[PDB]
């Protein structure tokens, strides 16, 4: 993807006007610097490889992190899967209106000792379970629940000290592309909710300890990383200016277009 | 000459004598749905003379302290003739449009409009916890107006109409990435845009999804000396192109 | 029992690696594709579209539509300055938040030419001529029309065609330049001066406005992707 190179120019005195155009037509001018001045013939070897859509988006970025405690009833985490609880991955995906990509998940699970009271604690290595529940499946309500059998639900097991786990998810959707914006309602009577939450049904993700609470409580924390692969993007869109406030919608507080300087001639 | 056009659609004609060129979509022309991409199994209805014609919306006055206007336009034509009657009896529907904004002034006035047609414009509410209601988002063939000030957060369900943020929380100067034209009263006199069907599904219900939004924002405001005509109106005519419908049922 | 040997760099999580991973849903059937209009293949055609630049930041015009309007009147002297700003498309707050400056803040290096289109949004009976100069660095900012005529300039005559493109060239010692504010890789200044006056007839308003656009040429390039400094977060959005 090499860029175009400038050609040689000559002093002209003619009736052709490359500099004068008409911007009311909605058409940007296609001039190069060899029309308004004299230029030498250079040849560029610069490539546009890093500004591609695949190189811009296919990088891992965190989306959520949740904690859970070992020696505690109802200590387990859940997360409805959405890509708009962070500030930096949400801004990159909202440069386009429609996207279509495959995923690559990665979990980074840590642990920390809690202030117990038993003398000379000693615990073996911990094993975690991360279950994915598609929209409509039965959900667990406690830790030693029957729903962690995973008869059809895909889950992963991981022992502490190894490499982090990693799966891959294809393009799961009802429509032909993921939609980042939706100007409409859910009900046909145009009541109730309005925005992007109508099309978000990716599913839920559950996390727990497998080992029992031996002698000291242990609080773990799992971070979730998204990585889009094989990305196609349609209908570009201006980048977000105001700060994000909520998750379900695009509400904002008004702000100036730039920061101000003291004059129009100041540098 | 390159300043004259004539658009013929059905039993209606639009002529213009000074104008810029026309802007067609993202490079494509509106066409019908092919057999590779269809998902409905029943036969669609293509009337194509009763619905593909020019419908003229209501006029708005360009004052000196004007901020902007916006239409939605699957909803602006919901009461317009036989286009609004096929929208009620059918469940699905796809269409492309051609939009013609027109505003005339003499050689002694000055101003500049930005005629931009954006897809999927989610508008923000004034209160940060709520979403705006239906009557504040779109009126039937009547413009909703921006403001040059900020709507306070005491209002429950009202659209935030700060014009420099364009209601969507983006810079208003960066709205030129969508298909657009300018109406410069020095040279131009009317703007024309041809838009295809842009959606992530091949067909959509036309009553709970507005897949377009036409914004007219005066960047350089209207100004004239004393003596010239103080009343300058703006008129918008929209014509559907290649419309078809599926799923016939009762009236709704 | 093939004898292997694990190298350093094993069992690490590098966030920019291209590896294969086992799929969670085997034999899944995706939804077939559809010809959606407006497919973008590269980010260098988003930066090649014109966008209005807020030249007029005067501490109360940033929260208004007056930031984009450059005031031009009928003067009583010769050679007055219209505007002026240094050419930094990623650090200077004039070109910072445009369509070009919001892509340059995701990358670190940039190289290429920059177009600057001006539109005269005045009356149809007004005339005038302007000088659109660009001075490479090494000296200061030009303070006269005599100092600014010695650089790369173009003389714009208003008329039927209401736009003029000043295309600044790529004059530098290095192949690339830094996006952030640096003194070693400075780029210069862009100014505007009255060539002749703005002459209007009677009953015509003598105060006209000028819009300015900015884009990139066909030899623009960026490198070394980074994170943007314009977004920030304290807690999760919920």
């Amino acid at each position, epitope marked *: 993807a090499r860029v175009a190179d400038t050609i040689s120019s000559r002093p002209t005195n003619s009736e052709s006007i490359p500099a004068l155009t008409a911007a009311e037509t909605g058409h940007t001018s296609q001039v190069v610097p060899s029309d308004t001045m004299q230029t030498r013939h250079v040849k560029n070897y610069h490539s546009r490889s890093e500004s591609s859509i695949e190189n811009f988006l296919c990088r891992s970025a965190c989306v959520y992190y949740a904690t859970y405690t070992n020696n505690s009833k109802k200590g387990f985490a859940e997360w409805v899967i959405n890509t708009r609880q962070v500030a930096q991955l949400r801004r990159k995906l909202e440069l386009f209106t429609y996207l279509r990509f495959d995923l690559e998940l990665t979990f980074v699970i840590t642990s920390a000792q809690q202030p117990s009271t038993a003398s000379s604690v000693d615990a073996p290595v911990q094993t975690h379970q991360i279950m994915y529940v598609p929209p409509g499946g039965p959900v667990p309500t406690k830790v030693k629940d029957y729903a962690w059998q995973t008869s059809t639900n895909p889950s992963v097991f991981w022992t502490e000290g190894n490499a982090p786990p990693r799966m891959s998810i294809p393009f799961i959707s009802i429509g032909n592309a993921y939609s980042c914006f939706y100007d409409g309602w859910t009900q046909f009577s145009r009541n109730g909710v309005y925005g992007i939450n109508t099309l978000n049904n990716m599913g839920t993700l559950y996390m727990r300890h497998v080992n029992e609470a031996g002698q000291g409580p242990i609080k773990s924390t799992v971070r979730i990383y998204f990585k889009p692969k094989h990305v196609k993007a349609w209908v570009p869109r201006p980048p977000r200016l105001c700060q994000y406030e909520k998750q379900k919608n695009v509400n904002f507080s*008004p702000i100036g277009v730039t920061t101000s300087r003291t004059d129009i001639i100041t540098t | 000459s390159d300043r004259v056009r004539s658009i013929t659609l059905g039993n209606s004609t639009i002529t213009t004598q000074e104008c810029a060129n026309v802007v067609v979509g993202y490079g494509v022309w509106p066409e019908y749905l092919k057999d590779n991409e269809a998902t409905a199994e029943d036969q669609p209805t293509q009337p194509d003379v009763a619905t593909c014609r020019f419908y003229t919306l209501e006029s708005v006055q360009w004052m000196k302290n004007s901020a902007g206007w916006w239409w939605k336009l699957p909803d602006a034509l919901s009461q317009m003739g036989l286009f609004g009657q096929n929208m009620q009896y059918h469940y699905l529907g796809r269409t492309g449009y051609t939009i013609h904004v027109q505003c005339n002034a003499s050689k002694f006035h000055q101003g500049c409009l930005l005629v931009v047609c954006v897809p999927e414009a989610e508008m923000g509410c004034s209160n940060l916890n709520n979403t705006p209601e239906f009557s504040e988002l779109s009126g039937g063939d009547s413009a909703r107006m921006f403001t040059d000030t900020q709507v306070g957060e005491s209002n429950a369900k009202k659209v935030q109409t700060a014009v420099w943020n364009a209601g969507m929380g983006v810079g208003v100067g960066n709205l030129t990435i969508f298909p657009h034209q300018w109406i410069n009263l020095r040279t131009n006199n009317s703007a024309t845009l041809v838009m295809p069907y842009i959606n992530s599904v091949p067909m959509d219900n036309m009553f709970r999804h507005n897949n377009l939004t036409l914004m007219i924002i005066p960047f350089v405001p209207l100004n004239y000396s004393e003596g010239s005509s103080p009343y300058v109106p703006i008129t918008v005519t929209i014509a559907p192109m290649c419309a078809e419908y599926n799923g016939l049922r009762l009236a709704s | 029992g093939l004898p292997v040997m694990t190298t350093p760099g094993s069992t690490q999580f590098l966030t920019s690696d291209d590896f294969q991973s086992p799929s969670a849903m085997p034999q899944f059937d995706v939804t077939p594709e559809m010809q959606i209009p407006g497919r973008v293949n590269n980010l260098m055609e988003i930066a090649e579209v014109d966008s209005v630049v807020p030249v007029n930041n005067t501490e109360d015009n940033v929260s208004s539509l007056k930031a984009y309007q450059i005031p031009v009147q009928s003067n009583s002297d010769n050679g007055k300055q219209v505007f002026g700003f240094p050419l930094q498309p990623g650090a200077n707050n004039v070109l910072n938040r445009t369509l070009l400056g919001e892509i340059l803040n995701y990358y670190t290096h940039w190289s290429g030419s920059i177009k600057l289109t001006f539109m005269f949004c005045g009356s149809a009976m007004a005339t005038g001529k302007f000088l659109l100069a660009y001075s490479p660095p090494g000296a200061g900012v030009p303070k006269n029309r005599k100092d600014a005529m010695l650089g790369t300039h173009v003389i714009w005559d208003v008329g039927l065609q209401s736009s003029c493109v000043l295309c600044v060239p790529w004059i530098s010692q290095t192949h690339y330049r830094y996006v952030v504010e640096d003194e070693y890789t400075a780029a210069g200044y862009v100014t505007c001066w009255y060539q002749t006056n703005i002459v209007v007839p009677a009953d015509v308003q003598s105060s006209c406005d000028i819009l300015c656009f900015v884009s990139a040429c066909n030899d623009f390039s960026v490198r070394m992707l980074k994170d943007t400094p314009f977004i920030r*977060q304290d807690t999760f959005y919920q």
Partner: antibody
Amino acid sequence: VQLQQSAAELARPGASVKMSCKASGYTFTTYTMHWVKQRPGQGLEWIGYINPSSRYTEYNQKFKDKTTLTADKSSSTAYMQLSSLTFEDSAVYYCARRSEADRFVYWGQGTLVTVSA
Amino acid sequence: DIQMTQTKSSLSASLGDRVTISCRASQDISNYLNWYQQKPDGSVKLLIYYTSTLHSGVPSRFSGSGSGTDYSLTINSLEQEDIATYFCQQGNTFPFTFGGGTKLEIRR
């Protein structure tokens, strides 16, 4: 990253005071600046906010006719003027920087306002 | 407005005890609650920015619960640096209404 307020004030009944809350460590014209009043016998009480970029202020229904919130861009401070002081205006006033929609993450140390003779 | 009421206003427990502070609303605020902590020298800081989501930089003794109208805040092991005043704040309707104070002390 911190906010610093003024000292403790003292004024006659009917007079006017002007507090301040200098912000540092972040871009001042991005987040809104809120003011919270705490009487010593009650809980916290909201007064209003001000958008420092557009100079738009919005007050509560009780504190509308007394308080006035101003700000400046150069020194990166945010002022607040109380007028027509009565005996129930003797309290502690905090400044807070509003984060995402409904939470305040950074607070001030508060100034003590008293009225007497 | 939404009247955020804490009927406790004073609490007493020994060191190493589990305390519970409850805040009750006027109507359903739909999980939009925040918990703050006011130290006796005047400093206020945010503890839990949801019903149960802990802020960064807060120790893990704190935990929140509740749904609908009734809510709670729990410290499972009371320390010496936790002796402060705790407030609840809703973020559902305009304006923001704070709850009453709740001061903690030692048992005997």
